[PDB]
Design a protein around this ligand. Structure first.
Ligand code: HEC
Length: 107
């Protein structure tokens, strides 16, 4: 599975790699990417009000540690045709820290 991560390290990754396009708080605004509040346990393509690609909506998985760990390594491999332009977080320790941050930040 996905080992535990350090949320402070994960927050730094989020700020430097994700925050340009995403907010996490309940009621936070959509930007280029969707607000991520309530992500874990919810299917792809479900943030209310955001215009997703058909590719994202079609994927149909439930976001959790394992699916995020695969996605964030290479987003376009996991969801071909997605409009999220993000090369990927290649190091597993960095993905794990980021996922620990997301699990807590989007509760
Ligand atoms: C702007 C250049 C982006 C950056 C940098 C990151 N994300 Fe993103 N993300 C963006 C878009 C435009 C979308 C929608 C894609 C589509 O095809 O419609 C997304 C989507 C996600 C998702 C899926 C959300 C869901 O299904 O509701 C997640 C989990 C996600 N993005 C996470 C994420 C993280 C953690 C990032 C930093 C590593 C990151 N994104 C960067 C645009 C952009």
């Amino acid at each position: 599975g996905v080992p535990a991560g350090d949320v402070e390290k994960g927050k730094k990754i989020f700020v430097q790699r994700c925050a340009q396009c995403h907010t996490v708080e309940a009621g936070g605004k959509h930007k280029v990417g969707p607000n991520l509040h309530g992500l874990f346990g919810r299917k792809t393509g479900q943030a209310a009000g955001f215009a997703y690609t058909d590719a994202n909506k079609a994927k149909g998985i439930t976001w959790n540690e394992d699916t995020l760990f695969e996605y964030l390594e290479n987003p376009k491999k996991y969801i071909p045709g997605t409009k999220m332009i993000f090369a990927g977080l290649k190091k597993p320790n960095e993905r794990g820290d980021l996922i620990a941050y997301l699990k807590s930040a989007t509760k």
